[PDB]
Amino acid sequence: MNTVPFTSAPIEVTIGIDQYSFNVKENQPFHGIKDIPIGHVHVIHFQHADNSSMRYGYWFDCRMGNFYIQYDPKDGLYKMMEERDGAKFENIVHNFKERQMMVSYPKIDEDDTWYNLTEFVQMDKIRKIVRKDENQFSYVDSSMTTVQENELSDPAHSLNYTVINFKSREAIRPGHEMEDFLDKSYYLNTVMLQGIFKNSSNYFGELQFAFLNAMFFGNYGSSLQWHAMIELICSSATVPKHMLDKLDEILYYQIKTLPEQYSDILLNERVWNICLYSSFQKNSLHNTEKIMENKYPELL
Amino acid sequence: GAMNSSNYAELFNNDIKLFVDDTNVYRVTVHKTFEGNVATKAINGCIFTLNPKTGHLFLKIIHTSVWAGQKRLSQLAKWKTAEEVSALVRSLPKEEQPKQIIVTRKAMLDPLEVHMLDFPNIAIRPTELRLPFSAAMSIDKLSDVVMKATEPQMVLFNIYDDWLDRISSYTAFSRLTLLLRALKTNEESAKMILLSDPTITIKSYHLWPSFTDEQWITIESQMRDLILTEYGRKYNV
Numbered sequence: 018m019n020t021v022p023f024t025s026a027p028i029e030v031t032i033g034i035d036q037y038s039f040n041v042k043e044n045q046p047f048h049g050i051k052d053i054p055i056g057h058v059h060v061i062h063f064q065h066a067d068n069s070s071m072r073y074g075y076w077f078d079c080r081m082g083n084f085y086i087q088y089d090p091k092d093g094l095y096k097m098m099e100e101r102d103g104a105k106f107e108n109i110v111h112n113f114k115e116r117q118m119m120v121s122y123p124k125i126d127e128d129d130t131w132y133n134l135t136e137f138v139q140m141d142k143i144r145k146i147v148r149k150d151e152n153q154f155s156y157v158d159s160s161m162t163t164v165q166e167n168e169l170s171d172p173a174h175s176l177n178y179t180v181i182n183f184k185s186r187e188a189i190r191p192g193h194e195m196e197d198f199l200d201k202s203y204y205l206n207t208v209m210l211q212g213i214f215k216n217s218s219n220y221f222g223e224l225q226f227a228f229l230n231a232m233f234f235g236n237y238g239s240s241l242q243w244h245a246m247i248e249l250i251c252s253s254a255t256v257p258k259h260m261l262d263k264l265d266e267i268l269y270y271q272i273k274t275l276p277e278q279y280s281d282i283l284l285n286e287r288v289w290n291i292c293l294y295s296s297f298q299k300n301s302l303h304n305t306e307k308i309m310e311n312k313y314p315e316l317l
Numbered sequence: 318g319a320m321n322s323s324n325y326a327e328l329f330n331n332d333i334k335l336f337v338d339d340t341n342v343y344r345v346t347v348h349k350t351f352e353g354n355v356a357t358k359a360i361n362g363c364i365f366t367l368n369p370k371t372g373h374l375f376l377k378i379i380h381t382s383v384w385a386g387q388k389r390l391s392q393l394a395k396w397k398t399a400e401e402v403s404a405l406v407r408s409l410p411k412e413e414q415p416k417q418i419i420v421t422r423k424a425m426l427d428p429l430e431v432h433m434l435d436f437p438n439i440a441i442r443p444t445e446l447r448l449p450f451s452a453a454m455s456i457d458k459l460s461d462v463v464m465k466a467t468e469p470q471m472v473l474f475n476i477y478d479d480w481l482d483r484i485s486s487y488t489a490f491s492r493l494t495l496l497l498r499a500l501k502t503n504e505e506s507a508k509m510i511l512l513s514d515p516t517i518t519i520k521s522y523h524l525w526p527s528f529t530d531e532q533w534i535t536i537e538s539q540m541r542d543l544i545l546t547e548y549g550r551k552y553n554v
Protein backbone atom coordinates (compact mmCIF):
# COMPACT_ATOMS: atom_id res chain seq x y z
CA MET A 18 0.00 0.00 0.00
CA ASN A 19 2.03 3.00 -1.28
CA THR A 20 2.00 6.62 -0.17
CA VAL A 21 2.32 10.00 -1.90
CA PRO A 22 3.44 12.31 0.95
CA PHE A 23 3.05 16.13 0.70
CA THR A 24 5.65 18.60 2.07
CA SER A 25 2.72 20.90 3.09
CA ALA A 26 -0.53 22.45 1.76
CA PRO A 27 0.21 26.21 1.64
CA ILE A 28 -2.82 26.99 -0.60
CA GLU A 29 -6.47 25.92 -0.30
CA VAL A 30 -7.06 23.24 -2.95
CA THR A 31 -9.44 20.41 -3.89
CA ILE A 32 -7.18 17.29 -4.16
CA GLY A 33 -8.29 14.38 -6.39
CA ILE A 34 -6.89 10.85 -6.11
CA ASP A 35 -8.39 8.73 -8.92
CA GLN A 36 -12.21 9.03 -8.61
CA TYR A 37 -12.04 10.43 -5.01
CA SER A 38 -11.45 14.05 -3.87
CA PHE A 39 -11.24 16.10 -0.64
CA ASN A 40 -10.96 19.83 0.23
CA VAL A 41 -7.73 20.99 1.98
CA LYS A 42 -7.68 24.46 3.69
CA GLU A 43 -4.78 27.01 3.27
CA ASN A 44 -1.94 25.80 5.64
CA GLN A 45 -4.07 22.79 6.91
CA PRO A 46 -1.66 20.19 8.42
CA PHE A 47 -2.00 17.81 5.45
CA HIS A 48 0.91 15.47 4.55
CA GLY A 49 -0.55 13.30 1.81
CA ILE A 50 -2.33 10.09 0.74
CA LYS A 51 -1.55 6.55 2.05
CA ASP A 52 -2.94 3.00 1.34
CA ILE A 53 -2.83 3.62 -2.47
CA PRO A 54 -3.48 0.24 -4.16
CA ILE A 55 -0.42 -1.26 -5.92
CA GLY A 56 -1.02 -2.71 -9.40
CA HIS A 57 -2.75 0.21 -11.12
CA VAL A 58 -1.76 3.64 -12.47
CA HIS A 59 -3.13 6.54 -10.37
CA VAL A 60 -3.79 10.18 -10.96
CA ILE A 61 -3.44 12.89 -8.30
CA HIS A 62 -5.14 16.16 -9.33
CA PHE A 63 -5.66 19.69 -8.12
CA GLN A 64 -8.16 22.52 -8.38
CA HIS A 65 -7.12 25.66 -6.44
CA ALA A 66 -9.92 27.27 -4.34
CA ASP A 67 -8.84 30.75 -5.61
CA ASN A 68 -8.42 29.90 -9.37
CA SER A 69 -10.54 26.87 -10.56
CA SER A 70 -8.64 27.42 -13.91
CA MET A 71 -5.57 25.72 -12.32
CA ARG A 72 -6.92 22.13 -12.97
CA TYR A 73 -3.94 19.77 -13.41
CA GLY A 74 -2.39 16.57 -12.16
CA TYR A 75 0.05 13.70 -12.31
CA TRP A 76 -0.32 10.18 -13.66
CA PHE A 77 2.00 7.87 -11.68
CA ASP A 78 2.66 4.24 -10.68
CA CYS A 79 4.11 3.73 -7.14
CA ARG A 80 6.02 0.63 -8.39
CA MET A 81 8.18 2.98 -10.59
CA GLY A 82 9.51 5.12 -7.65
CA ASN A 83 8.91 7.15 -4.48
CA PHE A 84 6.82 10.21 -5.42
CA TYR A 85 5.90 13.21 -3.20
CA ILE A 86 4.07 16.54 -3.78
CA GLN A 87 5.61 19.93 -2.86
CA TYR A 88 3.94 23.32 -3.54
CA ASP A 89 6.16 25.61 -5.70
CA PRO A 90 5.28 29.23 -4.79
CA LYS A 91 7.10 30.49 -7.94
CA ASP A 92 5.16 28.43 -10.57
CA GLY A 93 2.14 28.47 -8.22
CA LEU A 94 1.31 24.79 -8.31
CA TYR A 95 1.55 21.49 -6.47
CA LYS A 96 4.47 19.65 -8.14
CA MET A 97 5.09 15.90 -8.22
CA MET A 98 8.72 15.02 -7.51
CA GLU A 99 10.69 11.77 -7.16
CA GLU A 100 12.75 11.10 -3.99
CA ARG A 101 15.69 8.80 -5.06
CA ASP A 102 16.82 8.34 -1.37
CA GLY A 103 14.52 5.37 -0.42
CA ALA A 104 15.47 5.58 3.33
CA LYS A 105 14.87 9.37 3.72
CA PHE A 106 11.45 8.82 1.98
CA GLU A 107 10.40 5.84 4.23
CA ASN A 108 11.51 7.92 7.28
CA ILE A 109 9.39 10.99 6.27
CA VAL A 110 6.31 8.80 5.42
CA HIS A 111 6.65 6.85 8.76
CA ASN A 112 6.59 10.22 10.75
CA PHE A 113 3.53 11.59 8.82
CA LYS A 114 1.63 8.25 9.27
CA GLU A 115 2.52 8.20 13.04
CA ARG A 116 1.13 11.77 13.35
CA GLN A 117 -1.97 10.62 11.28
CA MET A 118 -1.48 13.56 8.89
CA MET A 119 -2.33 11.42 5.79
CA VAL A 120 -5.76 10.71 4.25
CA SER A 121 -6.37 7.06 3.39
CA TYR A 122 -7.17 6.11 -0.27
CA PRO A 123 -10.86 5.36 0.48
CA LYS A 124 -11.35 2.10 -1.51
CA ILE A 125 -14.46 -0.03 -0.72
CA ASP A 126 -13.33 -3.73 -0.95
CA GLU A 127 -16.33 -4.71 -3.27
CA ASP A 128 -15.60 -1.70 -5.60
CA ASP A 129 -13.68 -2.45 -8.89
CA THR A 130 -14.38 1.04 -10.41
CA TRP A 131 -10.73 2.12 -10.70
CA TYR A 132 -9.53 -1.26 -12.07
CA ASN A 133 -12.41 -1.12 -14.60
CA LEU A 134 -11.49 2.43 -15.78
CA THR A 135 -7.72 1.72 -15.97
CA GLU A 136 -7.75 -2.00 -17.02
CA PHE A 137 -5.58 -1.36 -20.15
CA VAL A 138 -3.82 1.86 -19.13
CA GLN A 139 -0.02 1.39 -18.60
CA MET A 140 2.45 4.10 -17.37
CA ASP A 141 4.84 3.29 -20.30
CA LYS A 142 2.02 4.19 -22.84
CA ILE A 143 1.02 7.33 -20.85
CA ARG A 144 4.69 8.52 -21.02
CA LYS A 145 4.67 8.21 -24.88
CA ILE A 146 1.43 10.29 -25.08
CA VAL A 147 2.91 12.79 -22.49
CA ARG A 148 6.67 13.23 -23.27
CA LYS A 149 8.79 14.45 -20.28
CA ASP A 150 11.36 11.62 -20.24
CA GLU A 151 13.31 13.01 -17.21
CA ASN A 152 10.23 12.18 -15.00
CA GLN A 153 8.57 8.75 -14.29
CA PHE A 154 5.22 10.56 -13.72
CA SER A 155 3.19 12.51 -16.35
CA TYR A 156 1.72 16.04 -15.93
CA VAL A 157 -1.67 16.80 -17.60
CA ASP A 158 -3.96 19.85 -17.34
CA SER A 159 -7.23 21.22 -18.78
CA SER A 160 -5.47 23.46 -21.43
CA MET A 161 -3.00 20.94 -23.04
CA THR A 162 -3.74 20.53 -26.77
CA THR A 163 -3.36 17.32 -28.81
CA VAL A 164 -0.89 16.86 -31.73
CA GLN A 165 -4.04 16.62 -33.99
CA GLU A 166 -5.52 19.89 -32.51
CA ASN A 167 -2.11 21.65 -33.15
CA GLU A 168 -2.16 20.48 -36.86
CA LEU A 169 -5.42 22.52 -37.49
CA SER A 170 1.37 25.54 -30.79
CA ASP A 171 4.15 24.25 -28.34
CA PRO A 172 5.13 20.61 -29.18
CA ALA A 173 6.80 19.82 -25.76
CA HIS A 174 3.52 20.34 -23.72
CA SER A 175 1.22 18.39 -26.16
CA LEU A 176 -0.84 15.18 -25.77
CA ASN A 177 0.62 12.75 -28.41
CA TYR A 178 -2.64 10.76 -28.93
CA THR A 179 -2.72 8.60 -32.12
CA VAL A 180 -4.14 10.81 -34.96
CA ILE A 181 -7.50 9.45 -36.21
CA ASN A 182 -9.05 11.21 -39.26
CA PHE A 183 -11.91 9.48 -41.18
CA LYS A 184 -11.26 11.79 -44.24
CA SER A 185 -7.50 11.13 -44.59
CA ARG A 186 -5.48 8.98 -47.05
CA GLU A 187 -4.46 6.88 -43.95
CA ALA A 188 -8.15 5.99 -43.46
CA ILE A 189 -9.15 5.51 -47.17
CA ARG A 190 -7.48 3.04 -49.60
CA PRO A 191 -7.35 4.40 -53.20
CA GLY A 192 -10.18 2.68 -55.19
CA HIS A 193 -11.91 1.75 -51.85
CA GLU A 194 -13.31 5.29 -51.13
CA MET A 195 -17.02 4.51 -50.46
CA GLU A 196 -16.22 1.07 -48.93
CA ASP A 197 -13.54 2.39 -46.48
CA PHE A 198 -15.58 5.57 -45.58
CA LEU A 199 -18.85 3.71 -44.87
CA ASP A 200 -17.10 0.64 -43.24
CA LYS A 201 -13.95 1.66 -41.28
CA SER A 202 -12.87 -2.03 -40.61
CA TYR A 203 -9.71 -1.65 -42.78
CA TYR A 204 -8.74 1.55 -40.89
CA LEU A 205 -9.50 -0.07 -37.44
CA ASN A 206 -7.99 -3.57 -38.07
CA THR A 207 -5.12 -3.06 -40.58
CA VAL A 208 -3.96 0.58 -40.12
CA MET A 209 -4.66 1.10 -36.38
CA LEU A 210 -4.78 -2.33 -34.60
CA GLN A 211 -2.18 -4.37 -36.65
CA GLY A 212 -0.26 -1.26 -37.90
CA ILE A 213 0.00 1.29 -35.02
CA PHE A 214 -1.37 -0.07 -31.66
CA LYS A 215 -0.12 -3.69 -32.37
CA ASN A 216 -3.12 -5.01 -30.29
CA SER A 217 -6.57 -4.07 -28.83
CA SER A 218 -5.04 -3.72 -25.30
CA ASN A 219 -2.91 -0.69 -26.41
CA TYR A 220 -5.97 0.77 -28.30
CA PHE A 221 -8.18 0.37 -25.20
CA GLY A 222 -5.45 1.83 -22.94
CA GLU A 223 -5.26 5.01 -25.07
CA LEU A 224 -9.12 5.23 -25.22
CA GLN A 225 -9.33 4.80 -21.37
CA PHE A 226 -6.54 7.40 -20.79
CA ALA A 227 -8.29 9.85 -23.18
CA PHE A 228 -11.57 9.46 -21.19
CA LEU A 229 -9.86 9.95 -17.80
CA ASN A 230 -8.02 13.14 -19.03
CA ALA A 231 -11.42 14.37 -20.40
CA MET A 232 -13.21 13.61 -17.09
CA PHE A 233 -10.57 14.71 -14.54
CA PHE A 234 -9.15 17.81 -16.37
CA GLY A 235 -12.03 18.75 -18.75
CA ASN A 236 -9.34 18.35 -21.47
CA TYR A 237 -11.29 19.03 -24.72
CA GLY A 238 -8.74 17.33 -27.06
CA SER A 239 -8.83 14.17 -24.87
CA SER A 240 -12.64 14.10 -25.14
CA LEU A 241 -12.32 14.40 -28.98
CA GLN A 242 -9.84 11.46 -28.91
CA TRP A 243 -12.10 9.24 -26.68
CA HIS A 244 -15.13 9.80 -29.05
CA ALA A 245 -12.95 9.24 -32.17
CA MET A 246 -11.70 5.83 -30.86
CA ILE A 247 -15.31 4.74 -29.92
CA GLU A 248 -16.62 5.92 -33.33
CA LEU A 249 -13.83 4.06 -35.28
CA ILE A 250 -14.85 0.72 -33.60
CA CYS A 251 -18.65 1.37 -33.90
CA SER A 252 -18.35 2.35 -37.65
CA SER A 253 -16.42 -0.91 -38.44
CA ALA A 254 -18.55 -3.85 -39.70
CA THR A 255 -15.77 -6.34 -38.80
CA VAL A 256 -14.51 -6.13 -35.16
CA PRO A 257 -13.19 -9.12 -33.12
CA LYS A 258 -16.10 -10.29 -30.80
CA HIS A 259 -13.82 -9.99 -27.68
CA MET A 260 -13.08 -6.33 -28.59
CA LEU A 261 -16.88 -5.62 -28.78
CA ASP A 262 -17.49 -7.46 -25.44
CA LYS A 263 -14.59 -5.54 -23.80
CA LEU A 264 -15.60 -2.13 -25.34
CA ASP A 265 -19.13 -2.61 -23.86
CA GLU A 266 -17.53 -3.11 -20.38
CA ILE A 267 -15.12 -0.14 -20.75
CA LEU A 268 -17.83 2.31 -21.85
CA TYR A 269 -20.28 1.06 -19.19
CA TYR A 270 -17.85 1.97 -16.34
CA GLN A 271 -16.91 5.33 -18.04
CA ILE A 272 -20.63 6.29 -18.32
CA LYS A 273 -21.25 4.98 -14.74
CA THR A 274 -18.42 7.16 -13.29
CA LEU A 275 -19.07 10.38 -15.33
CA PRO A 276 -20.52 13.11 -13.00
CA GLU A 277 -24.24 13.63 -14.03
CA GLN A 278 -23.70 17.46 -14.29
CA TYR A 279 -20.90 17.08 -17.01
CA SER A 280 -22.69 14.75 -19.51
CA ASP A 281 -23.84 17.95 -21.39
CA ILE A 282 -20.18 18.99 -22.25
CA LEU A 283 -18.32 15.57 -22.01
CA LEU A 284 -20.75 13.53 -24.22
CA ASN A 285 -21.02 14.18 -27.99
CA GLU A 286 -24.73 13.71 -29.02
CA ARG A 287 -23.84 12.78 -32.66
CA VAL A 288 -21.24 10.08 -31.81
CA TRP A 289 -23.37 8.39 -29.08
CA ASN A 290 -26.64 8.44 -31.14
CA ILE A 291 -24.65 7.06 -34.16
CA CYS A 292 -22.81 4.41 -32.03
CA LEU A 293 -25.89 3.17 -30.11
CA TYR A 294 -28.68 3.50 -32.79
CA SER A 295 -27.24 3.73 -36.43
CA SER A 296 -23.78 2.04 -36.51
CA PHE A 297 -22.71 -1.55 -37.37
CA GLN A 298 -22.34 -2.14 -33.59
CA LYS A 299 -25.73 -0.53 -32.60
CA ASN A 300 -26.68 -3.97 -31.08
CA SER A 301 -23.21 -4.93 -29.67
CA LEU A 302 -23.11 -2.56 -26.60
CA HIS A 303 -26.00 -3.86 -24.39
CA ASN A 304 -24.52 -2.71 -21.05
CA THR A 305 -23.52 0.72 -22.44
CA GLU A 306 -26.92 1.31 -24.19
CA LYS A 307 -28.85 0.36 -20.99
CA ILE A 308 -26.81 2.66 -18.68
CA MET A 309 -26.89 5.56 -21.25
CA GLU A 310 -30.73 5.19 -21.70
CA ASN A 311 -31.31 5.07 -17.86
CA LYS A 312 -28.74 7.80 -16.91
CA TYR A 313 -28.71 10.23 -19.94
CA PRO A 314 -32.00 9.76 -21.89
CA GLU A 315 -32.09 13.53 -22.83
CA LEU A 316 -28.78 13.25 -24.80
CA LEU A 317 -30.17 10.46 -27.09
CA GLY B 318 -17.65 28.02 -47.18
CA ALA B 319 -21.11 28.06 -48.87
CA MET B 320 -21.80 29.72 -52.24
CA ASN B 321 -24.81 32.11 -51.78
CA SER B 322 -26.54 35.33 -53.09
CA SER B 323 -23.75 37.42 -51.36
CA ASN B 324 -20.67 35.80 -53.07
CA TYR B 325 -22.43 35.33 -56.49
CA ALA B 326 -19.92 37.31 -58.65
CA GLU B 327 -17.16 34.82 -57.58
CA LEU B 328 -18.67 32.38 -60.21
CA PHE B 329 -17.43 34.70 -63.02
CA ASN B 330 -13.89 35.49 -61.77
CA ASN B 331 -10.78 33.87 -63.30
CA ASP B 332 -10.52 30.96 -60.75
CA ILE B 333 -11.52 27.77 -62.63
CA LYS B 334 -14.55 26.28 -60.90
CA LEU B 335 -17.13 23.58 -61.68
CA PHE B 336 -20.66 23.08 -60.41
CA VAL B 337 -21.54 19.40 -59.94
CA ASP B 338 -25.22 18.39 -59.94
CA ASP B 339 -26.05 14.70 -59.18
CA THR B 340 -29.92 14.99 -59.34
CA ASN B 341 -30.09 13.09 -62.73
CA VAL B 342 -27.45 10.38 -61.95
CA TYR B 343 -29.85 7.72 -60.58
CA ARG B 344 -33.22 7.84 -62.42
CA VAL B 345 -36.05 5.26 -62.08
CA THR B 346 -39.61 4.63 -63.27
CA VAL B 347 -41.66 3.12 -60.40
CA HIS B 348 -44.02 0.33 -61.68
CA LYS B 349 -46.36 -2.47 -60.43
CA THR B 350 -45.14 -6.12 -60.64
CA PHE B 351 -47.43 -8.96 -61.87
CA GLU B 352 -48.01 -9.82 -58.11
CA GLY B 353 -49.14 -6.17 -57.42
CA ASN B 354 -45.86 -5.15 -55.66
CA VAL B 355 -43.80 -2.04 -56.64
CA ALA B 356 -40.43 -2.22 -58.44
CA THR B 357 -38.12 0.37 -59.99
CA LYS B 358 -36.52 0.19 -63.43
CA ALA B 359 -33.46 2.46 -63.76
CA ILE B 360 -32.98 4.55 -66.93
CA ASN B 361 -29.79 6.21 -68.17
CA GLY B 362 -28.64 9.23 -66.13
CA CYS B 363 -25.93 11.91 -66.24
CA ILE B 364 -23.62 13.94 -64.04
CA PHE B 365 -24.03 17.67 -64.86
CA THR B 366 -20.55 19.23 -64.39
CA LEU B 367 -20.54 22.88 -65.54
CA ASN B 368 -17.86 25.65 -65.75
CA PRO B 369 -20.17 28.66 -65.13
CA LYS B 370 -17.55 31.10 -66.62
CA THR B 371 -16.94 29.29 -70.01
CA GLY B 372 -20.24 27.36 -70.35
CA HIS B 373 -18.25 24.06 -70.85
CA LEU B 374 -20.55 21.14 -69.77
CA PHE B 375 -18.88 17.74 -69.00
CA LEU B 376 -22.01 15.52 -69.33
CA LYS B 377 -20.99 12.06 -68.02
CA ILE B 378 -23.72 9.62 -69.10
CA ILE B 379 -24.50 7.08 -66.39
CA HIS B 380 -25.59 3.91 -68.22
CA THR B 381 -28.07 1.62 -66.33
CA SER B 382 -25.36 -1.19 -66.38
CA VAL B 383 -23.56 0.75 -63.53
CA TRP B 384 -26.44 -0.26 -61.17
CA ALA B 385 -26.49 -4.00 -62.13
CA GLY B 386 -26.35 -6.13 -58.91
CA GLN B 387 -25.62 -3.11 -56.68
CA LYS B 388 -27.51 -2.29 -53.40
CA ARG B 389 -28.48 1.14 -51.87
CA LEU B 390 -28.40 2.78 -55.33
CA SER B 391 -29.33 6.35 -54.08
CA GLN B 392 -26.17 6.16 -51.83
CA LEU B 393 -24.00 4.51 -54.50
CA ALA B 394 -25.08 7.26 -57.00
CA LYS B 395 -23.39 9.94 -54.79
CA TRP B 396 -20.10 7.91 -54.66
CA LYS B 397 -20.31 7.08 -58.41
CA THR B 398 -20.76 10.88 -59.02
CA ALA B 399 -17.66 11.59 -56.84
CA GLU B 400 -15.63 8.85 -58.63
CA GLU B 401 -16.52 10.31 -62.11
CA VAL B 402 -15.82 13.95 -61.04
CA SER B 403 -12.41 12.89 -59.56
CA ALA B 404 -11.65 10.86 -62.76
CA LEU B 405 -12.54 14.02 -64.81
CA VAL B 406 -10.24 16.27 -62.70
CA ARG B 407 -7.37 13.72 -62.97
CA SER B 408 -7.88 13.58 -66.82
CA LEU B 409 -7.49 17.43 -67.11
CA PRO B 410 -4.02 19.01 -67.38
CA LYS B 411 -3.01 20.72 -64.11
CA GLU B 412 -3.65 24.29 -65.45
CA GLU B 413 -7.23 23.20 -66.43
CA GLN B 414 -8.06 21.60 -63.04
CA PRO B 415 -10.70 23.51 -61.07
CA LYS B 416 -9.55 25.41 -57.91
CA GLN B 417 -13.11 24.87 -56.47
CA ILE B 418 -15.95 22.34 -57.02
CA ILE B 419 -19.44 23.51 -55.87
CA VAL B 420 -21.97 20.66 -55.31
CA THR B 421 -25.63 21.59 -55.72
CA ARG B 422 -26.55 19.05 -52.94
CA LYS B 423 -24.84 18.81 -49.48
CA ALA B 424 -24.98 14.96 -49.56
CA MET B 425 -22.28 15.18 -52.31
CA LEU B 426 -19.73 16.92 -49.96
CA ASP B 427 -18.33 13.86 -48.13
CA PRO B 428 -18.28 11.52 -51.19
CA LEU B 429 -16.47 14.16 -53.28
CA GLU B 430 -14.04 15.20 -50.45
CA VAL B 431 -13.06 11.51 -49.92
CA HIS B 432 -12.59 10.93 -53.71
CA MET B 433 -10.53 14.18 -53.99
CA LEU B 434 -8.13 13.52 -51.01
CA ASP B 435 -5.26 13.56 -53.61
CA PHE B 436 -6.28 17.25 -54.38
CA PRO B 437 -6.04 19.07 -50.99
CA ASN B 438 -5.84 22.47 -52.82
CA ILE B 439 -9.26 21.87 -54.58
CA ALA B 440 -11.96 23.35 -52.29
CA ILE B 441 -15.25 21.34 -52.21
CA ARG B 442 -18.11 23.79 -51.43
CA PRO B 443 -21.88 23.59 -50.94
CA THR B 444 -24.23 26.33 -52.13
CA GLU B 445 -27.27 28.02 -50.47
CA LEU B 446 -28.59 28.68 -54.06
CA ARG B 447 -31.52 26.44 -55.22
CA LEU B 448 -30.09 25.97 -58.75
CA PRO B 449 -32.46 24.43 -61.36
CA PHE B 450 -29.81 22.09 -62.93
CA SER B 451 -32.24 19.12 -62.44
CA ALA B 452 -34.07 20.52 -65.53
CA ALA B 453 -30.94 19.71 -67.70
CA MET B 454 -32.87 16.57 -68.89
CA SER B 455 -35.61 19.00 -70.23
CA ILE B 456 -33.03 20.15 -72.87
CA ASP B 457 -33.92 17.90 -75.87
CA LYS B 458 -30.36 17.30 -77.22
CA LEU B 459 -29.04 16.44 -73.65
CA SER B 460 -32.04 14.12 -72.94
CA ASP B 461 -31.48 12.49 -76.42
CA VAL B 462 -27.77 11.71 -75.97
CA VAL B 463 -28.47 10.30 -72.43
CA MET B 464 -31.41 8.01 -73.44
CA LYS B 465 -29.59 6.68 -76.59
CA ALA B 466 -26.34 5.79 -74.69
CA THR B 467 -25.67 2.01 -74.80
CA GLU B 468 -22.50 2.35 -72.65
CA PRO B 469 -20.79 4.83 -70.27
CA GLN B 470 -19.89 7.98 -72.29
CA MET B 471 -18.60 11.56 -71.64
CA VAL B 472 -20.20 14.16 -74.03
CA LEU B 473 -18.81 17.76 -74.13
CA PHE B 474 -21.24 20.71 -74.75
CA ASN B 475 -21.20 24.49 -74.40
CA ILE B 476 -24.46 25.13 -72.51
CA TYR B 477 -24.23 28.88 -73.51
CA ASP B 478 -23.99 28.11 -77.29
CA ASP B 479 -22.36 31.27 -78.80
CA TRP B 480 -23.89 33.74 -76.20
CA LEU B 481 -20.44 34.71 -74.77
CA ASP B 482 -19.69 36.38 -78.18
CA ARG B 483 -22.41 39.00 -77.26
CA ILE B 484 -22.92 38.86 -73.41
CA SER B 485 -20.84 38.36 -70.19
CA SER B 486 -20.75 34.99 -68.27
CA TYR B 487 -22.84 36.70 -65.51
CA THR B 488 -25.59 37.45 -68.08
CA ALA B 489 -25.17 34.01 -69.81
CA PHE B 490 -25.53 32.21 -66.39
CA SER B 491 -28.64 34.35 -65.45
CA ARG B 492 -30.23 33.46 -68.85
CA LEU B 493 -29.38 29.73 -68.33
CA THR B 494 -30.80 29.73 -64.74
CA LEU B 495 -33.97 31.53 -66.02
CA LEU B 496 -34.48 28.95 -68.88
CA LEU B 497 -33.87 26.02 -66.47
CA ARG B 498 -36.08 27.47 -63.71
CA ALA B 499 -38.89 27.84 -66.35
CA LEU B 500 -38.37 24.28 -67.75
CA LYS B 501 -38.38 22.94 -64.13
CA THR B 502 -41.58 24.82 -63.02
CA ASN B 503 -43.74 24.12 -66.14
CA GLU B 504 -41.86 22.14 -68.83
CA GLU B 505 -44.79 22.16 -71.35
CA SER B 506 -45.25 26.00 -71.11
CA ALA B 507 -41.45 26.67 -71.20
CA LYS B 508 -40.90 24.44 -74.29
CA MET B 509 -43.92 26.08 -76.07
CA ILE B 510 -42.31 29.56 -75.49
CA LEU B 511 -38.91 28.40 -76.87
CA LEU B 512 -40.11 26.41 -79.99
CA SER B 513 -43.35 28.23 -81.20
CA ASP B 514 -42.00 30.83 -83.77
CA PRO B 515 -41.01 28.41 -86.59
CA THR B 516 -38.57 30.80 -88.47
CA ILE B 517 -36.16 30.39 -85.42
CA THR B 518 -34.01 27.21 -85.49
CA ILE B 519 -31.51 25.45 -83.22
CA LYS B 520 -28.14 25.27 -85.07
CA SER B 521 -26.74 21.69 -85.33
CA TYR B 522 -23.87 22.54 -82.83
CA HIS B 523 -26.24 24.41 -80.34
CA LEU B 524 -28.78 23.48 -77.64
CA TRP B 525 -31.04 26.58 -77.70
CA PRO B 526 -32.76 28.56 -80.53
CA SER B 527 -30.69 31.16 -82.49
CA PHE B 528 -32.41 34.31 -81.04
CA THR B 529 -31.45 37.89 -81.94
CA ASP B 530 -30.71 40.11 -78.86
CA GLU B 531 -34.33 41.52 -79.06
CA GLN B 532 -35.89 38.03 -79.36
CA TRP B 533 -33.88 36.98 -76.20
CA ILE B 534 -35.45 39.92 -74.22
CA THR B 535 -38.94 38.80 -75.38
CA ILE B 536 -38.18 35.09 -74.53
CA GLU B 537 -36.66 36.04 -71.11
CA SER B 538 -39.82 38.16 -70.41
CA GLN B 539 -42.10 35.17 -71.28
CA MET B 540 -39.99 32.91 -68.95
CA ARG B 541 -40.30 35.33 -65.94
CA ASP B 542 -44.12 35.61 -66.56
CA LEU B 543 -44.31 31.73 -66.66
CA ILE B 544 -42.33 31.49 -63.39
CA LEU B 545 -44.43 34.18 -61.52
CA THR B 546 -47.85 32.71 -62.63
CA GLU B 547 -46.90 29.14 -61.44
CA TYR B 548 -45.75 30.77 -58.14
CA GLY B 549 -49.32 32.24 -57.78
CA ARG B 550 -51.07 28.84 -58.39
CA LYS B 551 -48.45 27.23 -56.01
CA TYR B 552 -48.98 29.48 -52.92
CA ASN B 553 -52.53 30.82 -53.83
CA VAL B 554 -50.90 34.37 -53.71
Ligand SMILES: CN1[C@@H](O)c2ccccc2[C@@H]1O
Nearest residue numbers: 022023024085087100106109
Ligand atom coordinates in the same frame (compact mmCIF):
# COMPACT_ATOMS: atom_id res chain seq x y z
C1 LIG C 1 12.94 17.02 0.16
N1 LIG C 1 11.62 16.42 -0.08
C2 LIG C 1 11.63 14.94 -0.23
O1 LIG C 1 12.70 14.28 0.44
C3 LIG C 1 10.38 14.53 0.41
C4 LIG C 1 9.79 13.29 0.34
C5 LIG C 1 8.59 13.11 1.01
C6 LIG C 1 8.01 14.17 1.71
C7 LIG C 1 8.62 15.41 1.76
C8 LIG C 1 9.82 15.56 1.08
C9 LIG C 1 10.66 16.76 1.00
O2 LIG C 1 9.89 17.93 0.72
